[PDB]
Design a protein around this ligand. Structure first.
Ligand code: TSL
Ligand code: TSL
Ligand code: TSL
Ligand code: TSL
Lengths: 265, 265, 265, 265
């Protein structure tokens, strides 16, 4: 019957919608189009940081990286301002998470090295976490104007949940680094209207958003109940029907979170 | 399956639980022990104010009412301070709602007049709103130490919902007065951890709480969705199992509200 | 010329206003009626907690304290709810700071012992910190209806600043305890509209408010610049002119903080 | 007093600093190097939009403009992506304000027509608003890399304030258009750490930034007090001392705004 409540939101908001919450000690998993493909958008920036955290020691975040005016092809609210000054890996990661800065993302991919501009290195990282399905070829901005049906630059709710789970809750990173990533996500600016707004205030929520064309809108998060019980929530949507220029509806993502909060409480 | 989620909370929290939300233009009502009797506790102070608003002109709120130090039997954080000075009907109502002042309650019942200390007059008022089941017999504090099963000083979730609906949303009161009551409930101090904490912040919530012995804990509220859709939510509980001195669990009330928010979103 | 800006606010808001910030390594202090007496209101609850932290070991916070329904004479949003269950010293302190609970305050004074209900014990504590001027005689609620000119239950901005400085920044408490107090103040609920609202968001602010009759309104705080430079800010006001029933203006407190932020930046 | 506080910031940050706030119904203006020349940087994009709003009817914003890959000389986060699709005047203006897109800027100058690439047409527009000092000669990127002392592509705080005032507050534009421009500025992405960060959150702020070599960093804004009183704030800086390669300090701009907020409150 929760299936039917998601299908309702789908109809109201004129969108296809994908939801995954893994199982726990107590609870059974929650599936809805969980094994269908969706566009990543900016959601892959979460693991990306983790990949950079994984590859290098912890003092590596101090390395300053320089770049040019014509390195800014994507929207980049932080990179734009620090062309003269440059930016350290540390600041790059902060921005990529907290502000969804597109340029930084690309710089960090380059920090991974390897062909594809570091997209292979990163693809490789996901496999280390047992992620077969997710696939990534292009960078920002080009990847977020790929057409519907195209399986390049895509993932499933099921998949990305299990990644985020291993990173945050699992032992995929040392505690010190893990800490950093949570801290960053805990302070995301771009996610107020989506998963955060669907949960009660007494729940703790850390999230990473994704947006694009064809009404594409995603949010992946870890939440803690008022008694500190952790849960992973992958929410993904699109509106490929209204074409390229369709607007995403955060309201959709907020409403679903509320249904989910209901079963989890 | 929502039936099964309430029965779960019941088992977790070792409590009996009553829930009612009336039907709307779209949605069907939500019932769970909705037609079972529970203790009012301090929840009856909401209609009580309405009864005093209903019976008298609007300038009647300026009438000063004096009382003694030994008129303070219940918890009365506001009555305590204004013993020498007295208090106007207006300020009495504010206190009764916003602070759940027990003395004021009794003063207002006396303002209704009639035997029972004004409990019959008040019982009479509810019938004017088509409320058959509800009964009120004693005053504060004595009423909050009635034993389980005793039908004096009781109501059903179903009933009190339909009252609150008529008062707040319906035309049971002139707009000016209606306004006052909503304003007061909007500014309740005593309700943070119950219904308010079960809904997302982007919902508007006005509530009136109740507490007592045998783990008795109630909260009735009107909520607005993020798009201004109103709903009435009656939640009532008790824990007569652990006897007189069983502690109430607000956690229970907050958790249920969350399940409810889930179906309403 | 900052003198003239405070006198302006005074005239606009029809209020007397007291401001103190101590001197630092760099900066000179800020004075305006800093050595004039004002009512404490709920501001004394900050040191009060410190006095209880000072007097007893750290394990003492687990001692559960019981009380009756008629022990709630003041407004007490948390004491209200935990009459059946009781409350530990630890929880009492949290409430007294975070919610300005009036009852708890009085219970804690009783924990200090001595005549005056523990007001002498507490008065004694301030002298240990070299505070000459500050005086405390009555408890809640009686102290909040002292008339203007009455020097009982009063302090100066200068004084209370130097206390708060020693507690938070100075070595007046062991680090562990100090930590607790800061944590509590960092999470004050009652202070959003006063000092907090006069500083830019990139400043860190921890505060403790006070309100009462005769438009009495205070806020004492520690702030950190965006680069972690600490400062102590005492702000106090009243409007004894419009009599007992004069309303306090938080706007006044927020405006002054802004003038202060200006010199500190 | 305040003169000396600006000279301090100057010394701290190793920079020359220009500040202007016009006079109001109440307050006297604020001058500090207000009549000295500074580089525009990207600040001129504000009036530029206004000039295009002024010259043409309101439906002109729908005219699509196409361009080539080799038309993208400057930083252009939006122009980069819409080479295939093209962009309407409407979208061009949004970008120029909200994202400080450098290409769009140049396209719009071309929309004005005339020699200099439309820089004379634009220079001409400012004179219509009674602005004598301001001049513009080159386009992006070339204009941001021309040396200190060179009076081409420059303005004074005094001047640009009086322009922004007339546009936003004054009757320089019809309400409908005026509305558009404010809306755009209200939604600037590039300005978080400058003027916006120096004011308290309860102030409303709309801004337009500028950055360049020789530590050049500007922000012009309209602010509303918490009670809706409007003010215009021009802040400009540079660090020609450390030569071409000197890094700009937004911190400087944020600090000054704080001093200004202080006098305005
Ligand atoms: C991540 O969610 C995407 C970042 N930004 C894009 C979006 O649609 O939100 C763009 C297209 C603005 S970016 O220039 O690629
Ligand atoms: C409203 O919920 C009831 C308040 N009653 C109190 C009273 O003093 O009458 C108590 C203490 C009996 S109950 O614990 O709320
Ligand atoms: C802090 O001590 C202020 C207390 N005074 C008032 C308040 O704001 O709580 C009263 C007078 C309402 S107190 O609770 O009696
Ligand atoms: C406007 O001030 C922005 C101009 N863009 C850049 C350019 O390449 O011209 C800079 C370097 C001046 S700015 O640092 O973003």
């Amino acid at each position: 019957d929760l299936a039917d409540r998601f299908a309702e939101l789908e109809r109201r908001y004129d969108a296809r919608l994908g939801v995954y919450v893994p199982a726990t000690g107590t609870t059974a998993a929650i599936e809805y189009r969980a094994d269908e493909r969706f566009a990543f958008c900016s959601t892959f920036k979460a693991p990306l940081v983790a990949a950079v955290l994984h590859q290098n020691p912890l003092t590596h975040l101090d390395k300053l990286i320089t770049y040019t005016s014509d390195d800014i092809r994507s929207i980049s609210p932080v990179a734009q301002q620090h062309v003269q000054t440059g930016m350290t890996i540390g600041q790059l990661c902060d921005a990529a998470i907290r502000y969804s800065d597109g340029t930084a993302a690309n710089l960090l991919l380059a920090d991974l090295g390897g062909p594809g501009g570091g997209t292979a290195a990163f693809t490789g990282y996901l496999r280390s976490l047992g992620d077969t399905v997710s696939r990534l070829d292009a960078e920002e901005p080009e990847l977020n104007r790929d057409p519907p049906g195209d399986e390049r630059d895509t993932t499933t709710p099921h998949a990305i949940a299990l990644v985020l789970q291993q990173l945050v809750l699992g032992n995929a990173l040392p505690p010190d680094k893990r800490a950093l990533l949570t801290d960053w996500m805990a302070r995301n600016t771009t996610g107020a209207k989506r998963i955060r707004a669907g949960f009660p205030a007494d729940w703790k929520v850390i999230d990473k958003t994704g947006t694009g064309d064809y009404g594409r809108a995603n949010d992946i998060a870890v939440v803690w109940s008022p008694t500190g019980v952790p849960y992973v929530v992958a929410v993904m949507s699109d509106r490929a029907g209204g074409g390229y220029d369709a607007e995403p509806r955060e309201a959709l993502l907020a409403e679903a979170a509320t249904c989910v909060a209901g079963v989890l409480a």
